[PDB]
Design a protein around this ligand. Sequence first.
Ligand SMILES: O=c1ccn([C@H]2C[C@H](O)[C@@H](COP(=O)(O)O)O2)c(=O)[nH]1
Ligand SMILES: O=c1ccn([C@H]2C[C@H](O)[C@@H](COP(=O)(O)O)O2)c(=O)[nH]1
Lengths: 258, 260
Amino acid sequence: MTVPTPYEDLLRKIAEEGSHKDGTGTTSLFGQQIRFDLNEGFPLLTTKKVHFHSVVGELLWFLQGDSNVKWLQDNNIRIWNEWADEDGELGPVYGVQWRSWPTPDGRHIDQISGALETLRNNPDSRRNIVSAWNVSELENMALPPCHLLFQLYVADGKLSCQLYQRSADMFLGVPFNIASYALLTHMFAQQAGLEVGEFIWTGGDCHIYDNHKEQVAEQLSREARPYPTLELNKAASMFEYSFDDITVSGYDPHPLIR
Amino acid sequence: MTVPTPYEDLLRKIAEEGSHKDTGTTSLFGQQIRFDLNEGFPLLTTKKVHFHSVVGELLWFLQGDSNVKWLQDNNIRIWNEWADEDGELGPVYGVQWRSWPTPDGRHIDQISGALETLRNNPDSRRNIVSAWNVSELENMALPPCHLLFQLYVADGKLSCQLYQRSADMFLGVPFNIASYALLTHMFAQQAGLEVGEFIWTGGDCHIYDNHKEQVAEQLSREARPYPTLELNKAASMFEYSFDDITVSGYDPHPLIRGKV
Ligand SMILES: O=c1ccn([C@H]2C[C@H](O)[C@@H](COP(=O)(O)O)O2)c(=O)[nH]1
Ligand SMILES: O=c1ccn([C@H]2C[C@H](O)[C@@H](COP(=O)(O)O)O2)c(=O)[nH]1
């Protein structure tokens, strides 16, 4: 009464008032913001089929902090393949910065387990930040980080997460990005015994490619169903979740577009 | 002829809807403010914002120095409590902007890089500048607060989004807006671009308790039109001087005072 549509709302807004940049064309707006109350449903979009298994597998692998694509393939996820080299290696992308941001001693920082310690010990911390925008290592990455930083925050025993995402393919990328951080934020809350607050997605260039005009125009005509809800069995730590611990229930998306 | 007040709007929202905590704060997380820069210079008029200091800290960031000295020599004491016997701060803000240390022993000038791509690849969706150098955090007197920003070009107009992890809504934020707005102006002038929006996205946006009355006083004032920024095209991004930056037609309500 009704179902919130912060995503489709932004989707629409860009199509109507985005300006046009020019190897295929786009219409963009800059600096937008989406937010979901996580208690209020799991934000896996229903106006089109968002494949959740790959959302989950990417995340578990981000969390392993490994830069070889193997474990994805071994688990039937090929979304990173095209960027891998012959040996299946991508450079120090997302997970690698997250678990092992290198320092000029011999060592590395684990911002994930870092971030966890400060949830448990200091929830009011105003500096609970993970970053993958490691300026000095970008040259070595297959692809410069897109969703490049997020911040954790606690109010009334409820965890919120904000994501800064530099560039957003509204149609193909975003929905997938938001389901992935919504899940990570659920994992964080569970591993520190807290309820879930909001996920805030904040973007730079939020864009629709010209070749999505018809597809977007379509999704935009469908009415939303209620969001599914997330079922999460508690693993022993952030780094020991498996596919079996993670399911959505009551997910009834409209059919895929594309 | 209505004056947008997104800053005050957020202030109002935090006071009305925020979440209290324990020297205490009331807070909201993940908030955004935008100004149309072509609509004037976002120097608050619901209270006198000191500008010379804003301009001072910026020039300082941009010359990229660990030391506090240039600021002392120009009557800016605001970083004095943080610096050691030598006036040294560690590789805070400006050191990362101009010389983010590479593992191959070099340094990345991000400001130059950003300008370079404003000029050569304006469409680029990767024009990032960051101060959040995880590996240097611990050498910093203070961890970066306004910690990354992105540039973007729409229709010849330049826009800037700042991500700021933590926000003293009353005391620090108005300086932060002024500073970044002036910053985006400097980028645009040099790139030969016009000005679009400035966007302030914050993480933990709080009003400190010891500022309740100061905030109600401010909220109680009808706002005045923003001054306009007169900026004189210096030779590079790094050649700007106080002579170069003034604000005209600035009509603020009386100074409101708070401490930390
Ligand atoms: O997690 C991601 C990664 C990439 N993209 C999209 C946005 C851009 O269209 C493209 C990245 O290209 P550049 O912004 O670097 O040009 O991929 C996303 O939407 N989400
Ligand atoms: O540019 C700045 C730097 C700091 N702060 C505020 C936010 C916090 O109240 C305090 C920084 O302290 P921590 O959040 O890191 O504890 O100062 C600002 O408002 N603007």
